[PDB]
Amino acid sequence: EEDTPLTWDDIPHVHTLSLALGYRLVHLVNKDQGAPLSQRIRGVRRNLSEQVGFLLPEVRIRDNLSLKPNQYTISLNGEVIEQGFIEPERLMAIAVGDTYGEIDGILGSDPAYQLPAVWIEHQDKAKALNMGYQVVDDGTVIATHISKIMKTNLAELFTHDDVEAMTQRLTQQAPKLAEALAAALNPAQQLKVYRQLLLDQVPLKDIRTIANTMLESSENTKDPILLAADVRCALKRTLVNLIAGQKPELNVYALSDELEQMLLTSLQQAQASGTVVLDSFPIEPNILGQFQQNLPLIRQQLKQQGLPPILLVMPQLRPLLARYARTFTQGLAVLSYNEIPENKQINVVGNLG
Amino acid sequence: EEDTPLTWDDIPHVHTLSLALGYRLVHLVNKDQGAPLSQRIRGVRRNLSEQVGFLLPEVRIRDNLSLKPNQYTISLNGEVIEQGFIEPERLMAIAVGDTYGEIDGILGSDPAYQLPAVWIEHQDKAKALNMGYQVVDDGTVIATHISKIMKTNLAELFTHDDVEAMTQRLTQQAPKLAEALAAALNPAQQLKVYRQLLLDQVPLKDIRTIANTMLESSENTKDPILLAADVRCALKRTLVNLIAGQKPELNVYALSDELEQMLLTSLQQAQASGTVVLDSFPIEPNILGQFQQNLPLIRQQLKQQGLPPILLVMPQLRPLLARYARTFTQGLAVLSYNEIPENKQINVVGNLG
């Protein structure tokens, strides 16, 4: 009543990641009933931090009664991105596709990868564990969802303030490099580069061999898409090691010489303007529908054989097609030619007409 | 009599928001009779502050005998904007449209949204509450009116002094961003951008992901309408989340290819001059009457189906049509194409001939 001063502080900040927790599943943060979403959530936030190099933000957790008593929503920067439904006390199990037999569990879905799911009681673990199922506790069904959301939205999770912390962690290793890098690219320019690297989900663990490449290639162009190409050409090793396995033989698609040429025409035309697009899209010659059609099949065709999906392109089209594979197909990999080692021999599968 | 020095201080300042309180309803601020307009008014000024991000001004309250003993006027920056009439002691109830039955209450109107209203005694609440009505105390009839006035005039409520407080509240989060933003856009330039964002009523809660976008896009253009487009493309998520619901399917209008083209002609023509208008209006080819005619129907046609009103345009016409929907229709939403996610599939309703 005597809040007679309202101050800007009364306005609550917004947070990058936040969890909404409905009634039936608030027995997960209460610090007594073996709160998983203070360790399991840190489990993901660590076993993914140390993997992608930069400390992922702190997942905050709130419980808005506004929603159904047994659901949760994950919010990126202000508001929901994905919203799942948790069974009251029936643990979920997944059948990868090699498991056989079913259990009495109520059908559901996998909120992570859109797989069929059965929600089984706490006792039937044996029947799941002895039939070959992939059972998971309640909290993990969330934590895996948060992991997928982080791994997808990696870009927006990298703030204009980590670019300070990255240079700190890099001065710890090569203290003379940053002192020569920060004077070559102002942090506004650096961040765009890390954004372009994290969009296509490239790990920034070995920051030295990344600042080295930015410092090198900074002379020619300060464009943050020509720079993100060079860093990827320098990380070709870990790129392919993460996309495909250590098997030297490699299977991938390739652009159809016709369609591939048809695009380069568009880029050259748009080159009339001052590269109005960086490379994300210069021209939409109505083949965008053809793409939005094939790229799902392109993922699925290679998912008729089990091998991970990859796609080869010209380097000049590399940065473009990354945007499509980032929106249309939830899973893909667009690699250039020079981004693949001369060690791993590749095997084209076919064109795309 | 010995006020022999008259000093500039004797001149009373003017205030952004101020309330006028006639006789019959001064029993609302007197601090004894459960003064609602020191808590309810703060109720709105808080549950709207924390929503739109920036601390709304302090509503001042005065009682000029000049007016009828039972009316009130709300004043923005010097003088009345809206003026309501309060029944002596008969509480008002509203029938949303789904409620059935009437009560003895004297007819009136809803000062908020122009709805039919009945003013009932304090006892008939049950008959209202058991018939399905929306009854409200005297003070709330005001407080809701103040809320509507704030939510409409948000722009003029954002002073050239908050741009200091916004950077303070943003240094609290990303202290290295402002120190790199304030050196990129002088506060005179920043404010115009926040003005353009608040005109179409976009929340500024997540200031980090807004300064980030202004800092980014500041290289190309310092025009505060090309900047307000990029911030909205970056907030597309919360934009649509606030206009429509979380339902992925979406229904909206679209410009008639003919009329849409007819405007772009006008913009290109005006491009002869140095973009004499930012984008609010380059050319009035007498289709302004057609607009002032349709936009009311455009609101109402979609109010024949209950779904919230939206309108799609070209991005190059986006900033223009925002001015019309800000004046002609008290409620509308003009969204571009790139301002809508690729997640929510849209459903056009029809052109506008």
UniProtKB/TrEMBL annotation, chains A, B:
GO terms for cellular component: plasma membrane
Domain of life: Bacteria
Main location: membrane
Keyword annotations from UniProtKB, A to Z: Bacterial flagellum biogenesis, Bacterial flagellum protein export, Cell membrane, Cell projection, Cilium, Flagellum, Membrane, Protein transport, Transmembrane, Transmembrane helix, Transport
Lipid bilayer topology: Multi-pass membrane protein
Compartmental location: Cell membrane
Function: Required for formation of the rod structure of the flagellar apparatus. Together with FliI and FliH, may constitute the export apparatus of flagellin.
Family affiliation: Belongs to the FHIPEP (flagella/HR/invasion proteins export pore) family.
Protein name as it appears in the record: Flagellar biosynthesis protein FlhA
UniProt source species: Vibrio parahaemolyticus
Shown residues within the full chain: 344 to 696 of 696
